[PDB]
Design a protein around this ligand. Sequence first.
Ligand SMILES: Nc1nc2c(ncn2[C@@H]2O[C@H](COP(=O)(O)OP(=O)(O)NP(=O)(O)O)[C@@H](O)[C@H]2O)c(=O)[nH]1
Ligand SMILES: [Mg+2]
Length: 195
Amino acid sequence: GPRKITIALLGLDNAGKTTLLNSIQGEDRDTTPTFGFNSTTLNEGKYKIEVFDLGGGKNIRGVWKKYLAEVHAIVYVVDAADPGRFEESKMTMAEVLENQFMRDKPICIFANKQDLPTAAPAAEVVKGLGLATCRNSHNVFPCTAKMPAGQDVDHRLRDGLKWLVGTVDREFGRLDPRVQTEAEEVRQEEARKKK
Ligand SMILES: Nc1nc2c(ncn2[C@@H]2O[C@H](COP(=O)(O)OP(=O)(O)NP(=O)(O)O)[C@@H](O)[C@H]2O)c(=O)[nH]1
Ligand SMILES: [Mg+2]
């Protein structure tokens, strides 16, 4: 059987995670704010990829840390057309990166909503997310998770996925055992909730 990567799709509410997940799986669909999560599976090269699309609202965000132990990598989505929110997206990513289970895991950052006239380029989003100081491998890809009526999805989305998967693939020998071990350790400690 094939190797399995697990990925968390994170970013602030309204960034476009759920739409991006849909579009990456080939399906235009309607979306409402995620007050929980969506979960699906993708094929990319030699890997089966489990993707967890978590809600980004301020009252859902605390859930993210419950996944970081079982994840090999992150897709972080930013609404590139809303610089008003760059600073909270920066603080939100910082929190994820500070987390103990994030060390050495790669981040694919999608600068989403490039169809909007105010969309910031990759450079701007690097500044805005304060990535100059980030020491998790990362790359920023502009994209449009919501292409118009009738258009093909944006190839930039798979490009970003392929960079992520290739980065995980390159370290898989060290990363996967750590994920498996770290994940079970956390899964073990949540058996507690009876007491
Ligand atoms: N113009 C434009 N709008 C987009 C794009 N991507 C998503 N949207 C829109 O942005 C809004 C939020 O998208 P959605 O994927 O639900 O956001 P989300 O990150 O899952 N929000 P939450 O974290 O609360 O579930 C929706 O109206 C959606 O159609 C895009 O590339 N361009
Ligand atoms: Mg959503």
